[model samples]
Target: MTEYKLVVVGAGGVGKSALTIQLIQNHFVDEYDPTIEDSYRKQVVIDGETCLLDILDTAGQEEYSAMRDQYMRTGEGFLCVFAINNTKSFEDIHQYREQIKRVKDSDDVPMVLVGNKCDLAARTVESRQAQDLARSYGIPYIETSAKTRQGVEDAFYTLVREIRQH
Candidate 1:
């Protein structure tokens, strides 16, 4: 089995958990599932490729950013999420990128920026902000919707494909 891990890094209420669940299980979270803990680990298969992606759903707006170490040790790639209605979440990608680098210590690790909640494009923060950020990080970017399933596979499979290629 190809064991690959993916973490969803983002700010609070930015749909990190929702997107993670949607991509992995094809479902959506209704209301705020506070009792649903901060992180989770799950596996997925792409195109009959038996790969295990440990999906980590982190709490948006973390307290002190201390988990950087834990994530690096466990994670293979990341799906950085931000809300379409929220601009700060998009801007916060830089901070997330820095933390990942600090722990992983590699520039080539596959990653992608997901402008999530594309169903709410009217509340959008920016159209190409994620694309721009991903470009700067030498990664890929796409707008996603846990509701409509837009870009879900692209966000997950694209990074995994990149990782396997290298």
Candidate 2:
């Protein structure tokens, strides 16, 4: 089976784990179960391509900056997520891209910029602004809602497809 490492970066409570879970199992956890840890691993086959998907979901605190760097260094691709209603989270995309560049130093590593919580667009933090930012970076971006399960798989699998094409 093909192996791919996927590192998901985003501020805490922005649905990083939830997005992973939904993509793999269509499950969503309402409460942050203490039983769960900071990472997840699973195998998935998207459109007949079998592969192992390893996800390192890091804590969003500044202290975990190095951890994010390490993951980015080794990851096949990255997905930087932000809540649709959280403007700072959207802005953090810049830092996330910089961190990945610092680690990999390769602009060719494909990434997907995600705006989660599309279920709450009424409370959106940034709308077309997200499109503008992703366009500026030349990466694909999608608005998603873990609560309603919109674009959950599309966002992640799009990155996987891009990686395969490379």
Candidate 3:
């Protein structure tokens, strides 16, 4: 069976856990979950292939030498996430993107730019701007809402597909 190890990297309180929970659990939770990270497994099929999806939900700390390097090193694909309502949260996305490239030692790593909390009208990051950023990175930009389950599956599934093509 094929395996794709996916990693979720985002600033704190950007719904990193929320998005991942919706993808893996298929449930919407309004209450905040823990910021700590964990791994989860699910069976998924895309392009006529049954594959094992290993997802890593990450916390938002700037890390040192432990599991930070471990996940980025081993992760096959990464979803760089941010909240649409928080510009600062979106601002940190470059750090994750840079670190992923640095750890992978390649600029062509499989990745996706995920903008969460799209249901909120108080969005500080515009869709056009996000699109431009993703365009520059040559990665897909996906808008999602964990509260409404919008684009959650596509965001996760696209990462696996990205890995597949790479």
Candidate 4:
């Protein structure tokens, strides 16, 4: 089976782990506990071909900056996530993108810009603005709600498709 290493990164409490948990376990978590670089694996079929999907859910704390490069070096694809309610998390996406490029040593690394917490009523970042940024980066933009299970699978599956193409 084809194996792909997918890394999820964003600021703390941006719902990176929540999204990963929803995609893997099909559940939503109400509590927010910080993640310290967790690995998840699942066998998935994309376009009738079976593949092994390995996801590394990264810690968003600034203290983890030293280890970020190590995860970036090993990841084949990435989901640069942010909370729609937090503008700072949205703005920091470019840093994550640049880090991935630097560590992977390729400008064409597969990635998707994810705006999470779509269920929230108070949003600081507009969908159009996020979409424009993703367009500028030449990557797809997706909005997902981990609580309602909206577009969660689409985000993961889209990344897997991009990884396979890469």
Candidate 5:
């Protein structure tokens, strides 16, 4: 079986753990504080191939910055997530994307720009802006809702496909 090391990164409160758990457990976590790093693993089929996913859910605080380089280096794919209702979270995705590229020492990496919390109505970031940014980065943009489980699998699966091509 092929394995993909996926890392989820974003500012605090962007629902990184929620998205990861929703994928692993098929349920939403309503309350959470991700000040600690967590790892998740799953075996599934994507594009007719059995794949083992090793997901790293990053801490939401800068306290884990010292450990960031390690995960960033080992990860093969990344879900650069941001909350749709938070403008700052949306803006910070740029840093995470850049950081990954820098850590990997390659501009061509498997990544997906994720907009989480799409089930909420008070979206502060426009889909157009996110799409434009993704276009510039030459990557795919997927909007996901951890609560409703919308586009959650697509986000990760697309990253896997990107890794396949990478």
Candidate 6:
């Protein structure tokens, strides 16, 4: 079976853990303490091909920045996430993308731009803007709501597909 390492990243409180949890556990959590770092593994099938998926959920705090390059280096694919309700969180994705590109030494990395917290009523960044940004990077853009369990599986599965293709 194909094995892939997927990394989930975003600013703190952007629901990175929530989305990761939903995808792996098939449930939504109302709250999670700020994560330092965590890893999960599962077998998933896309288009009837089963593969081993290893997911790394990372810390969003600035203090964790020192460890990011290590994570970026080892991951085969990445999910750069942001909270739709927080403009700064969305804006910070640029830095994360840049860092990934820098560490991976290629712009053609396998990745997806994820806008989480779609269940929130108030959104600071427009979906069009997120789509445009993803388009600029030639990556897939996905909107997800962990509470409602929308697009969570799609985001991870899409990344795995990209990883396999790459």
- Write one digit per residue (lDDT tens) for candidate 2, span 1-166: 8877788887767888788878777887677632123556678887897888887676676654555566557787888889988888887889888878788877677788989888874555666888889889888888887777889889888888877766
Instruction: Score candidate 2 by TM-score against the native.
Output: 0.87
Worst 10 residues of 6 by lDDT: 63-72
Stretches > 4 Å off in candidate 4: 64-66
lDDT of 6 by residue, 28-68 (tens): 88976888788999998877988888899988988755676
Decide which is better by lDDT, 2 or 4: 4
Clashes of 1: 4
lDDT of all the models against the reference?
Answer: 0.73, 0.78, 0.86, 0.91, 0.90, 0.89
Alpha carbon lDDT of residue 125, candidate 1?
A: 69
- TM per candidate comes to 0.85, 0.87, 0.93, 0.96, 0.96, 0.95
Model 3: worst 10 consecutive residues (lDDT sum): 61-70
- Residue range with the least summed lDDT across 10 consecutive positions in model 2: 32-41
> What does candidate 1's lDDT look like per residue over 45-73, in tens digits?
77788777767666564553455457555
The alpha-carbon root-mean-square deviation between model 1 and the true structure, to one decimal in Å, is: 2.5
Give every collision pair in model 5. Answer: none
In TM-score terms, candidate 5 sits at 0.96
Model 4 C-alpha lDDT per residue in residues 1-166, reported as the tens digit of each score: 9888999999988999999999999999989888777899999987787989999999898875557778768999999999999999999998889888998999999999999999998999999999999999888999999999999999988898888677
Answer with 4 or 6, whichever has the higher TM-score.
4
The 10-residue segment with the lowest total lDDT in model 1? 33-42
* Better model by TM-score: candidate 3 vs candidate 6: 6
